[PDB]
Design a binder for this molecule. Sequence first.
Ligand SMILES: [Mg+2]
Length: 742
Amino acid sequence: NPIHDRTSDYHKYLKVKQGDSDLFKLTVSDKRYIWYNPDPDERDSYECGEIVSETSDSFTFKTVDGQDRQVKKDDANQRNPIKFDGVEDMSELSYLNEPAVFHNLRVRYNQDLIYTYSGLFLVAVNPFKRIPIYTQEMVDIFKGRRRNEVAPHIFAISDVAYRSMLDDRQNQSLLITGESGAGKTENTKKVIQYLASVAGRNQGVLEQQILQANPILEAFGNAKTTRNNNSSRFGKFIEIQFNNAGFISGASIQSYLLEKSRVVFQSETERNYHIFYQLLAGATAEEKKALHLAGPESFNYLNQSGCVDIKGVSDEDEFKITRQAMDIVGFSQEEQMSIFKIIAGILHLGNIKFEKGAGEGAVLKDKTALNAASTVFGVNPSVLEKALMEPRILAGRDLVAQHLNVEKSSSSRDALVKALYGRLFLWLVKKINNVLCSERAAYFIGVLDISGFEIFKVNSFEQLCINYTNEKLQQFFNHHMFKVEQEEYLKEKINLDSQATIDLIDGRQPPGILALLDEQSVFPNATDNTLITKLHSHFSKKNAKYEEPRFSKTEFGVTHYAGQVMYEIQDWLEKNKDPLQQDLELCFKDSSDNVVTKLFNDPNIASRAFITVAAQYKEQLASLMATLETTNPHFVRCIIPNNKQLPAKLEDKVVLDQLRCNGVLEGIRITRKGFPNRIIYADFVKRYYLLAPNVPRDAEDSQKATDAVLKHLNIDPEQYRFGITKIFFRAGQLARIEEARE
Ligand SMILES: [Mg+2]
């Protein structure tokens, strides 16, 4: 059994290597240490310090430097005894302090061990390199083991989900969140992998299509940013559908907040969506000519960032893969073509050059790209031309065609483009869903791949959505963790801020941000100023989660869970309306093209429902939360080790900052207050039997033994609770016990 075979790749890559002896003595030391801050300004940077002595209320220790120092016992960060370096769950630690949690992690990361439990969480640090732990071999080892049976691993947590579904006939959900670049999507993909393997019906297609869904999505929804070479520019929730028996029967997809802006603008050194690049790189010569195709350097929407390729990535090779998944999934050859055409047309539209002079109006001296795009799209260029610069507009009675300047003309085109893409994307999802989704499913396991809190330099409307979402999810956790912790105290017979923030945002009466925003969105002439004035009007000095800046006249601050956040209001009105000239709809509505027409002729795709972008999102979240609320949840927190996509570089500031945002640290804090340590009686005795002159290592009266020792040592009755099964210990208690003689 590779589980007990200490020479297996399982032991090799997932386990902390075991020696020939397990004897308590190995680990005996004379030393006691303290975690300290060599420099008080950097609070996240710590050194180990050897406690030298103690007074009644303080410790005194010995710095790295030789200097001596003094500490209040009640403020001190004691180091756990070395036996604890590497434990598979942070909860086994006795001293639960920040540095302490960091250290265990680190210790694991040093051995490439990237996964650790922290009570309910599975913590996962991105390694920045390939570890062969996701093999079929690996897969089959996880089938049916309990969480204590096996090493931490995304496979494990998913197996647990699966058995629970079967054994409780309850639906499940794994929540996978964290910063850009931390790993979410990888692991997300693993889960499906694993699932489709233990529970698929292979001697199969489904399974195939299901797997193939992602690639498709990623091509259209992922991009190369500064933070990651393959970032998901969208949120998503996967539902794996099963039948009563337990076999996979289908699935569905839900996307949230696609980054439409990226289509028409990419920050420096980043890239647009992959497709554009795959297309340019793998289209046949017959496809190129058919699509007026060229190099990226030739296309305004592609050539600006000054990045057109990813190191160690072949846009050409990726296209084949994509092309392949479209096949498996069920895209006709035509459909594929149309997709492309669109992708091309978009590019063309972006090349359209608007000059002036004549008046202030815009004109089209060159008509090239206009033609191309027109063609590809299957619409009347003149019509479109017109729709672009001479949109007719309602002056109420008067429908009168407005002639636009160059910027506004340029802007309309951009909107066009974003609509095109955003719809197309939806269209894909729906498409896929048609193929995979099962009306009649008995159970499911839902996977959420979404970012955690986003706090940049510049925080926009988009981030407000993400953080909102994040507050809702965080609170869900807290609720949950609370029941589940309360359940354990009974089974063993042993003895809020979120809402306010939530309210400020989404509240109806009184109204929160979203509400005020929405309100302003019926007024055509309202401006960002109008809006921000309204907000401060309502919350400044009146709401404690709100903050009116002392000088900025464009921002406000919301006090999130993760901490305070400054939002810039620039363009919220536009973002919330997500406008598009009717003439354009019309224009495109008469397309010759199959798909194209769909994107404008199907309400499901073409329209929000009159609905705001905010409102629509608010609804979307509501539902998600609702469904989640019906499942049993698993939480996975993904952690980026550093900022530079390196390996073997686990940065203290970077990691802790994450553990603070994502709740891992509070979980500890709160758990810390109780009886963090809860050992199985028999186990205690195994290690500790030699400390109290009495007892044998083995015993049927384990509870009696656990007692004799506790009695021996003369431990404070307050430091522990007798569980029916487990002995419940208070913080530091065990560490001391472990610090006793043989
Ligand atoms: Mg991702």
